Amino acid sequence: HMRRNDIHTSDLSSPRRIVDFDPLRIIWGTNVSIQECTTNFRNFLMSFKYKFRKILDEREEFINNTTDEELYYIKQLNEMRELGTSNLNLDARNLLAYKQTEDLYHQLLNYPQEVISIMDQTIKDCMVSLIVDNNLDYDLDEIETKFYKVRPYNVGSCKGMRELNPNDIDKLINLKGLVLRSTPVIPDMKVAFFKCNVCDHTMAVEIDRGVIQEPARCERIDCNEPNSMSLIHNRCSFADKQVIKLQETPDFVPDGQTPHSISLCVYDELVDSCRAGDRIEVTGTFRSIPIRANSRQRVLKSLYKTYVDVVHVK
Amino acid sequence: PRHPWKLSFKGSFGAHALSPRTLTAQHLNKLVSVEGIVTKTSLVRPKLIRSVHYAAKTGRFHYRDYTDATTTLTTRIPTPAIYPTEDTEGNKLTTEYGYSTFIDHQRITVQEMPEMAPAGQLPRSIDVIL
């Protein structure tokens, strides 16, 4: 139980964000329907062939029989089950190739936060169904405890960071760049461990959108001292977070533009996968946070700071 | 055929024709003429004198006057009147730039002229508000 820190997870079972518009249920602020997206991505996983990608790219004379007619993601999921791999690398143009998913591709670009979680859930469901249907010898328990995550890439043209607008925040963007340096591994708190000072009662609280709720009183019925829970910083569990300084090299440079450098955050397994000086292609969601003006005060700056929250690295 | 008239002074000042080095505290609260060289000239900044606001619920225009110790020669009670974001009845006020009045304000630094300054010592300077 470590979850995914590349994208903030969403609760598919919870009807909190669900609103009905007229039936058909939509997550508020999006046009993403959980059931429709799961069914569409499941059909895409069962029925995609690379000849669809060849047709989409107007590459007809290069179509072969032994590779294009084979079910692409079925054999990727088979070899991914065989090797213990927990990552699926999804090409975004393959969604445009299939007839039922050109909408989903757009929903992937506009709302990666919910759509990527939907793909993760239906990939896990397909991972279960691939051994349920064909009656494989693998035990269902190791598949169930494994948490499967998808990494979309090739999301579109590599537009410059300085050509982006505030309406592009929390959209999947793709950038070609050069790595200059990276910070050391930073522990982000994910579960907090509190112990009562007088009765040694220990409880653990999960983080909720970057905020940890400190318990004011002891949870035990016997002990109810106010202000008795103290946080032990070493008993609590952390997650990896790294910040990489990328020197962007876009395809198109406007008149009199001097190259800039951005900061991109990688999490969990993607930490230390990029060394200084290599040319890489990063796809990830475009983020913006407010920055505290002073350390002692909570007064935040009105002008936001933009960064790239990394999903996949090529 | 509204602005109040001001005064300017010329002529011999006698013992009040001084220098930034020569200015001491015995010349405070006195009219002095000071010859020097300008070293710093600050940015000309507008200073709000009267702010005019609009209450859309009552459709009325209110105003508030502001003053400080710089504009007056005689000191009075410092009464800090805040910027009115609402009127007495509690309605929201929208400020009306263009109907408010702003007076240009500058401050310069007059240092003693190097021609009559001492050749080795550090020079003296004063601040002048225009």
Partner: protein, 88 residues
């Protein structure tokens, strides 16, 4: 009955019969009161809906000016208005 009122009836609705000796003159309480700072010229309104207390001011004028804590103006023109700076 009035002699049966115990400490178990405190802050509880009770029904009691009796006779009335005296009815006092009508005091004037304030429901909505507008206040202005003495020198800060900050205008505030207090609406009070609890008038059932006796011998004690459960709602009073603020002990200090509320313009500083609100930070209403972007200009924000150390200035202290003083203890009890509001007039009704």
């Amino acid at each position: 009955p009035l002699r049966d009122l115990d400490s178990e009836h405190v802050s509880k609705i009770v029904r009691l019969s009796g006779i009335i000796i005296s009815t006092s003159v009508l005091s004037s309480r304030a429901t909505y009161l507008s206040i202005m700072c003495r020198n800060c010229r900050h205008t505030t309104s207090i609406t009070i809906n609890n008038f059932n207390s006796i011998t004690g001011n459960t709602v009073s004028l603020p002990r200090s000016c509320l313009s500083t804590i609100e930070s209403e103006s972007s200009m924000a023109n150390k200035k202290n208005c003083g203890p009890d700076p509001y007039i009704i």
